[PDB]
Each structure stands twice: as structure tokens, then as C-alpha cells.
Scaffold this active site. Sequence first.
Site, short mmCIF file in Angstrom:
data_model
loop_
_atom_site.label_atom_id
_atom_site.label_comp_id
_atom_site.label_asym_id
_atom_site.label_seq_id
_atom_site.Cartn_x
_atom_site.Cartn_y
_atom_site.Cartn_z
N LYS A 33 -13.43 -0.88 7.23
CA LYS A 33 -13.78 -1.37 5.95
C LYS A 33 -14.59 -2.30 6.74
O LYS A 33 -16.41 -2.90 6.55
CB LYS A 33 -13.28 -1.97 5.30
N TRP A 83 0.81 -0.91 0.26
CA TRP A 83 -0.19 0.19 -0.31
C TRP A 83 1.25 1.67 -0.15
O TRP A 83 2.03 1.10 1.15
CB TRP A 83 -0.99 0.18 1.89
N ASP A 135 -0.19 -5.64 9.59
CA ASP A 135 -0.95 -4.87 9.49
C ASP A 135 -2.54 -5.81 8.90
O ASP A 135 -2.62 -6.50 8.12
CB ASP A 135 -0.65 -3.36 8.13
#
Lengths: 401, 401
Positions: free
Chosen positions: A250, A133, A214
Amino acid sequence: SSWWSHVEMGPPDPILGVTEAFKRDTNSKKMNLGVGAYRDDNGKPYVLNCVRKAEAMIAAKKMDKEYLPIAGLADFTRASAELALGENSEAFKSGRYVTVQGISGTGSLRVGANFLQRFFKFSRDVYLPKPSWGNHTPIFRDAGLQLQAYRYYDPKTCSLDFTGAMEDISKIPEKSIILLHACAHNPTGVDPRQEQWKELASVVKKRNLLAYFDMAYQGFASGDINRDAWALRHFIEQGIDVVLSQSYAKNMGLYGERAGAFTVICRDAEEAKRVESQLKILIRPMYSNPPMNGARIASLILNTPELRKEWLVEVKGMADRIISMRTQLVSNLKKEGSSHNWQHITDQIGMFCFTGLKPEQVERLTKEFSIYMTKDGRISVAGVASSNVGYLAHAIHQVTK
Amino acid sequence: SSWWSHVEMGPPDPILGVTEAFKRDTNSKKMNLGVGAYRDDNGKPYVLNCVRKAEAMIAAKKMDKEYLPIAGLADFTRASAELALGENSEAFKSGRYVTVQGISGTGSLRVGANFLQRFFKFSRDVYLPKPSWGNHTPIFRDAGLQLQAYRYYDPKTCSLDFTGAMEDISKIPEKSIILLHACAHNPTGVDPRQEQWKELASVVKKRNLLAYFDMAYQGFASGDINRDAWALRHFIEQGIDVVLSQSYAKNMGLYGERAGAFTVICRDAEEAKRVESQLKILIRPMYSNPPMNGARIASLILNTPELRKEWLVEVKGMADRIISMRTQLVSNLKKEGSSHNWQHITDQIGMFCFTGLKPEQVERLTKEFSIYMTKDGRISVAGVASSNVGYLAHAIHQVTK
Ligand SMILES: Cc1ncc(COP(=O)(O)O)c(CN[C@@H](CCC(=O)O)C(=O)O)c1O
Ligand SMILES: Cc1ncc(COP(=O)(O)O)c(CN[C@@H](CCC(=O)O)C(=O)O)c1O
């Protein structure tokens, strides 16, 4: 010649800046496939039912708005650890951990990096996968650490270059820091297979590396939360004391509420206590104390049996829809007459698809079709609806024809 | 010998840690006069009426929870600048500013320090008043800047040492950074008089210093928002381009919601634009995007005529009550038979009182009476109610007798 005459015009963010651009377009058929934000089947922002209820319970209670402790809402904090670790876990059971409320995934990630910068005496390097990312770079860089890389994705074969990763990882110098995505690797959507993860465990253990996970997609990889947290738990159970960052943006659709947590697995509870003291000292001069809303909502859901079960059903629902859109996409592509192999679309998991499109194709897509995505060819399948899957496939086909 | 065997037990925060200690005490008569949090006349947390309504309007609207832009909610951002600057202001009117949503006062202060660390090429020193809010030190220090001091308070006379400040300020090296509290100096509760501020303006202008204002108490100094923002506005109008941090934690009772903003006064709108680009680049890897709740509430109040007026009445109400408690305190002290001069209690403004008590007296207070306050003798008058003002005075008297 004032104070800021020298400050230059910086560029827009590679991810977040997409939404800025999408906002300005006047085309009625525009689609925002840049950021990974879930849309319902009507192509609309979706606030979970359980979320709505939680909010309601909060209102009715006539709650205060007093400052939370530096480390966050206890209830939220203990619940996050539990969600990551599992209830039966010795780490959890023994209290060898410290969890601290964070400003979502980014804030948690950053608190950790800064913590590392300050207490990780054995090294200044953080090994990121290739690719990773976009935001991971500047997060470590601004915190004061050095960046490195390990092979991960192989674009020729649209998969995980396991041989290359193992090679690279086995050479990382002892005591260095390694970043791993718990599940739903962003942006490739390819994860190691369990047997694959078992092997990586050994090497990280063998080389004595600090594994930093993560976890921003717990529940979007398989649609099951316990399953998606497998690798993480396997490392801990092998004797690896990791550090970890969590996001509820999310999986609970708490995007703008900014709820998340940073955890450190310690040796004992006494160690936990001391690590805790220092994290607070680090947090205090950053933002003082964390935002209460998202934390209050999440805690309510995590800690209320009926809300929790509801939430799980909702998580499956979301993942399943994503699968559905992937499937329709490939099918529309075939229908439109595309020759290319689009199987990676359906092979990949999580919120995105790592398409393969070159930057010229992406430009076109935005210009002729008003379809917005990141420049690397990553699209947000999660933001596709039954009504526009056809428009998408037609565009992809036109630009790829 | 694990990863964190060397991490030491840090100490509890000098301010925030008071609440932690207060929480554990079992005495039914305990009072938390440490942090500056407003209590209603029943000694209870108070959520403003306008706040409640704003919340209600938000609910009824069935709003989403989507990610806000990196810089925050536009509406909130423009409204904060306006509240600080005044509607008629040339700075505001001309658009020569950039305001960015911040994680309350602390987060804004920190974004600014970090911004300075990175773009303020003329110096690494920040001049703080003596004394200043404990948290200002570590905020600048962790950001990468050096700390200095200018005289401010004179304990012999319980006032502002103007001669000493002027002396000190006139010697600060050109182009250095100076921190000023906009109103309700924390923790002395003593502010310069307007004529006094006029004089300070000259010298800051004359020496070419970057004036950094900390405005966390707009409306608590006089009970009037336009009045409390006088100095700030006077500097801007004299040609001084300041930077500023705002908090809505006290004045809107948004404590845990974490709403605030950081502003920079530029030369033009084009400069504004470039500064903006860089602040976003700095924010992105810190926390990515800000928390929406407090921002949504504040905007609604600031931008809805009837809510705004309501809010102002509520702000007077709060300030007036504080005055009332100060008055009662002094009177109870006299009644209890105290000999000391307690006039500073009523002379000081804002949320606190800088009492004079020595640390031995403070210890006693906590131990025998369960009255919690900071070690420097600072107490939160705002958290005093009609029902316990008498207990307070009796304690103060006993320990001071
Ligand atoms: C691996 C990973 N970690 C952390 C985060 C940050 O989550 P927050 O809780 O919102 O800070 C994201 C978000 N990934 C996104 C969302 C856009 C962004 O922040 O870059 C994505 O890839 O679109 C992520 O993919
Ligand atoms: C001058 C000043 N600036 C910034 C802040 C921080 O406000 P936030 O928006 O909550 O970050 C405070 C809070 N002063 C307090 C509250 C306790 C604390 O944060 O130290 C006080 O002095 O008790 C303050 O007095």
C-alpha cells in the site's frame, strides 16, 4: 471415478473474490470498493513517481536476474528493519534482530506463523482481535495453530471497547500469542490512543505474551511514518520482544510486486544468527528464494536520500486525499438529505470505512448501483475519486433512506 | 531464558549454501559450479535478449502494479499449459486442466504437495528416484507426506538402472504417488530413452499411480522444447492424468523473478473448475497472490510470435554452448594427461555433470583451486566459460591424478 471426483467446489474469497465479481459487471459507473487499493483522483491505479524512477535506475544499470539469497536482498532487509525500528533504536543498533524478505504481508505473516508452529513451545493459541482481517484466520489455521479472540470493536458506540479488551487480555494465559495491528486497524479503522497503547504494553508484559504485530499500513494512519510506528517501538523499548510482519503493497503501491518482510526481535546477535538459520531452513522448501523486483525497487527508494524524501511527500499526498474523500462523502450525504449520523466515516483512519450497512443494503448497492464492497459493510474510501464521490453518497443514501 | 534460547543453529543448504561460501572467497580465479545458473561464454550472468525486449515493451506501456488474481496472470497460465501440453493436445483443447501461477518451480511443487496432502485420499507416500534433487525431500516432508524411493541411477555403470527401476515401480502399492523428472534428471543428467519411457508409462498405468512430473528444464535436454516434453505428453495420451510443476528460471533465465506454474490434468472442465476453487483457497493463506514481473515477461515472450521464435533460438544457443564446454572439458582432461574415463561428462545432458569425485576431492578443489560444487560430486557445466575450462580440467586432473 477419477482422482478428484470428491473435491468440492469451494467458495470465492470474501475479499479478493469481490474484484472477481466486479470484473464481470458491464455497468459503466461501477466502483470497486472491495480490496484496499489506492486510486488517484481520476479513479485510476497509481504508480508512484519515486517508483517509476527507481525502475528507471534499475533498467539503466542493466542488472542481472540471478537468484537472491534465501533470506532476500540484504539491503532491502536491513532497510525494512530500520523503517520499522527507527535508526536510533537499541534493537537495531545492537543487531538483536533478524529480518527476512517475505512474499509481501501474507507471505511474511505465514512464514512467521509456521516458524511459531515449529519453535514456539509455550502455546498453540493465537489471540485475534474482534473483528480482524478475514485472512488472519486461515493463515494461522493452515500453519497449525489454534485461534482465539479478544474484544476490540464495539458496534454500538463505533469505537474501541477498551474495557473489554483489557479484561480479555488480562485473562489470556501466560506465554500465549497475541496479534496486534500496528496502526490502521483493518477493518475498523480505529486504533488505541497512545495512552491506550501504553496500558496494553504493561499487560502484555505482565502476562508474558508473545506480541505479533501486523504492519501493512505504515504511513496511512497519520500520514507520518515515524508516528504510525509508535506503538511497535514503544513495546520493544518496554522490554517486549515482538515478531513482526511488514507489507510495502500500500505505502509504496507495490501491490502485485509482492515485497514485504518478517522480523523477530531476539536477545542478542548470536540468537539472531541462530533464528536466521532456521527461518532459511523453513523458507527453502516453501518457495526457495524470494521475488527480486519489488525488493530491488523498495531498497532503491529506502536507501537513496532523495528518493526516500520524495516517497514521504507522496505518502502524505495519498493520506491527505483519503481524508478529502471522507470529508466529501459525509458532506454529500448531508446534501442528499441523509438523516443518519455518518461521523464515523470521518473519525476512522487508514484506507477504509466500517460503515454499519447490513448485508441486504450491500446486496442492493451492488445490484442497483454496481458499487462493490465486502459483506461486513467495509468500504474502500481510498478508491473513491472526486468524480464519483457524489454517485457513492447518492447510493448510500438511497439504500439507507 | 528468552523465547528463542532453545532454537539451534541449523546448517546451511547443501546447494544454495555453496553460493554463500563462494561469495566469501577472495581468490580471483574462483568458479561457482554449485547452483545450476547459466553463464555466458565470458562467464557472466546472461539475461536473454528477448527478456530485455519484453521488459522494454512493459515499460513503454506504463503498466500498473495492481494485485493479480489468486491463480496468477491468465495469459501466463494458459501459455504455460500450452507450452507443457502442446497446442494440438486433447487435454488442452478440451480444457480438462487447471494451471495456477506458482512461485517458480519450488513454490509450484509445494502448492501441489500441499494440495495432495489435503485431497489425495488414497495414500501419504511419494516415491522419489535415487538420487533426486536434494530439495524434493523437505518439500514433501514439510507438506505432510511420507517419502519413499525407487532405484534409478547405477554408479558402477554411470547410467540408469532400468531393471531396478522397473522392479521397484512394479511393486509400489496401488494409488501411491510417483515423482518423475520430465527431462534432464537432476543431478544425474541421465534420462530414460523414449522406448524406456513407453514401458514406464504402462507400469504406472497398470499400477494406478499418481504421476507427479517436475519440469524445470524444458529445452535443456535436447535443445528442443517439443522434444523435451515428449514423455509428459506421452503419459497424458496413454490415459494417465498427471500433476505437474514448471519453472522458467533456467530456460528464460528468470532465476530471481520467480515465475512458474502448477497444473493438474482432470477428467472434465467441470472438475477443473472445482479443483481450481480449492487451489485458490490453499494459495490465499500462503502468499495471497503471486509476483507479477516474471509472469508478465514470460507471457509477453510466449504470446508474441516474434519473441517466441527469438526465445527458441536463444534456448538452442544455450544448450549448444553447454555441449561445447562438455566437449572441451573432456579434451582438456586428455591434454592434461588424465587417465580416467571421462566419457560420462559428454554422455550426460542438461546443465550438470555427475562426475564421480569423492568428498575428499571436492574439499581439495575448493581449498586449493576455489572451485565450488556440491558435495555429491555434481558440477554445473553451464557455468563454465572458454576462458576457464582449462583451469577446471587442470584442477580436476590434479585432484584425481
Ligand atoms: C492487516 C493486513 N495484513 C496483511 C495484508 C496483506 O497484504 P499483502 O502484502 O497484499 O499480502 C493486508 C491486506 N489487506 C487487504 C488487501 C486485500 C487482501 O489481501 O485481503 C484488504 O483488506 O483489502 C492487511 O490488511
Ligand atoms: C528438478 C528441479 N526442480 C525445481 C527446481 C527449483 O527451481 P526454482 O524455479 O528456482 O525454484 C530445481 C532447481 N534446481 C537447482 C537450482 C538450485 C536450487 O534451487 O536447488 C539446482 O539443482 O542447482 C530443480 O533442479
